[model samples]
Target: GLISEEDKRIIKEEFFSKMVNPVKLIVFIGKEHCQYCDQLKQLVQELSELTDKLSYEIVDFDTPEGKELAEKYRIDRAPATTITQDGKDFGVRYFGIPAGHEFAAFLEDIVDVSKGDTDLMQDSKEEVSKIDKDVRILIFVTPTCPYCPLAVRMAHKFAIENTKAGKGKILGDMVEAIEYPEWADQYNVMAVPKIVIQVNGEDKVQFEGAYPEKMFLEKLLSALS
Candidate 1:
């Protein structure tokens, strides 16, 4: 009920057609007063309604079930979301409400997740498949940033590739800086699409802007070696 009729119609028209398989959206919410949890909960519920291919699960952070799922998925934050299919988690996360421009990226990811595969270029996927260790990709963004989605999508694609190949532990997160200012400040996020890559809990690489797929993969591969 949080989404208006006009918005519903638009969502159906623009992106629903691409949803060909079941997509599970899992949301982790905290106690009642948790920041953005209320809005984020409503957002996921409403977004899932646009297509029959989509379903959403809301987990209460205070519940035992929530604790189990959080540990299973390595989730440690509220207002977090992961898109999965057939119980497969590719480590794609959104740490804040997917509103504004980020909403489009969410829909894009929905389509990709629905297909149960990624849309990365063949060469890029090949490179991602060779990753032999854990990878953590943190992309900081603002809701209104026009170019942030590309960077987020790129990292997500890599995560999916690594997961599918079963070659590494990989996670890709899009952190809305406006909602998580503390993280933003810690990362010195002055520009949108500030991408940080870490391998095996060390050897971190940070950069700004959405680089081309070639360069993005290069940077990611560089972190491993």
Candidate 2:
């Protein structure tokens, strides 16, 4: 439920007056029947006030506009977010609630979208800038795996930073592998954190764990070429 008019007035006077220029947009889309959707919406609303520099929009998939927007944005899953800047798509997406270490990834995505800059070395930057096709990266993680968060964060960060990723899509999820054994079986996710990289509608490669930055850069360079 939205806040009352009285509270809204108070928020404008006491909160909005001190707000800064918000440069990032965090969009949440989920079906109405999803319990997780409700919970995530509440979480985003609560966190939105933490900084006037970050704002959020929660969209229910059941609504007509919500359905249209989701389809327009190519969202195939619920409980997802599309990170944008100044109304331009950043191609960063999250398909889960982003709990645990996933939160850190979410925070980093906000910063990247706000800054509208990708943090890559010149060589790596040049390599990614040449990507003319869409690259979809789906990273799977486990809550207890120490390196799982790093892997998830890296993929999203790379996509966010790459300027040539006009429609490049980056997404990730934290799966309690035991709880979601089906996903593990389907993706053959034998490791704590696995990154499945897809390029132009084909399965590319799956990295087993959190790879070092140098090695990761090498992979990205190879992928681009």
Candidate 3:
């Protein structure tokens, strides 16, 4: 098992203590070129065993089920994961194995999805709801970055609110920079918690470091403008 016994105990305690609703993890793996697919499945499986509130569905990327899900979720790569609540997709995606500091991001996403809530303010959700154009948020981080989770969580909150509003125009991707150096180079990422926003295939905005919720909302709104 990828998770040790001690870790499983702690995870069970934490998940049961905080999860209020069931969260489903949809994982996709390809036939080749996925180095961490097996480990990722094992990790998620052990996680599901820890709490009934957490469950997973593993799909081969080339299968019919995988193709349908990929088309629905705009997924184009292997080892991708999405968190869903009560059959509702919130546009949260992880493009690689969420390990190291990224593991916290994975755990936090589960908790938020289960609770069906975000820390975002009402005004922030309102602002995000007004967005009518397609928006893709890519948050780049190394597993060890302490402040990356704040940026990731904030981006995901916006994505959830946008999807919940029924627009389905926004996507939030947590990209572990160290695992995907190609993306890192493409975005010229030299620091952690680098947020890159794309609109309709074009780079709209980019920033570094984590900001307070209000300030982050301002940045997102400004990008839309």
Candidate 4:
């Protein structure tokens, strides 16, 4: 019962009604003392009940099946969710519970994946297609930050578009900063919306605040350059 009846009704009426294709949420959980594992499983189960287009599978992170799936998707932690369409992975990941403000982005991601499209500008797509090297975009955010969703959505879009371009060069992860304090410390995150671009296993670009879509694209391109 993670989702209230009223919220369920709203999701059924507002969200699922627009879904075009089926989206599978592959959730990885651990058997041991993972803090949010149970809650994350419950959340996805409740969400799946609201729409036939959305289905979820929970896998233990330590089992053989889990290890194979995790290796296929490059998942390295518990409570990780990956969105896929037609059994295809799109390189978008959520490293923590998508609650609070992050919930909107989660729902939006479902719709975007279901439709197999993104709202990114054509020029932005063109710019991202030229990238030849791997780009890992980590957006560190908290559940309470109102502006965090924009940054998360933008990064996810970049990942999706990059996957569609056949390069598989960009991967976006929405890292819940509060859930991983070591990540915050490693990246020197003192603010809510922090964007870190990592290349060659090292952080190459870092910034704070949620910029507009155009400016954000420019920043992403600048980092790649």
lDDT of each: 0.84, 0.63, 0.83, 0.84
1-225 in candidate 1: lDDT tens per residue? 677899899888887787777888888887632577778878888887777888899888788989899878867777688888746788888988887889889988887777757868899888888888878899999988999999999898888888888863888999988888887898889989899998877747999999989999999988887
Residue-by-residue lDDT tens digits, candidate 3, 1-225? 688898878876765469988988888888754677788898889888887778999888988888888878777777788888855788888877888877877888888878777878888888888888888889998878889888888889888888878886888889877667787899899988899988876888899998888987787778886
Model 2 shows how many backbone clashes?
A: 1
Candidate 4 collision pairs: none
TM-scores for the candidates = 0.93, 0.77, 0.91, 0.93
**True-vs-predicted CA distance for residue 81, candidate 4, Å:** 0.7
In angstroms, how far off is 161's CA in candidate 1? 1.7
Instruction: Name the better of 2 and 3 by TM-score.
Output: 3
- The per-candidate count of clashes, in order, stands at 0, 1, 0, 0
* Regions of candidate 3 where Cα sits further than 4 Å from its true position: 31-33
lDDT of 1: 0.84
lDDT for each residue of candidate 4 in 120-211, tens digit (9 for 90 to 100): 99998888777777788889899999999999899888888888888767778898876778877888888978998877566778899987
Candidate 1 lDDT at 85 equals 72
**Candidate 2: where is the Cα deviation over 4 Å?**
1-25, 32-35, 164-184, 221-225
User: What stretches of model 1 exceed 4 Å from their correct place?
Assistant: 31-33
Please report, as a residue range, the 10-residue window in candidate 4 with the lowest summed lDDT.
30-39
User: Clash pairs of candidate 1?
Assistant: none
Instruction: Give a tens-digit lDDT track for model 2, residues 1-225.
Output: 334557546544654444333645455465432456665677567556656676778777767888787777666556677766655666777665666666656656666666766566776666565566667776777656678778766676677656444535443333445444565677888876877776765667767878876677566556544
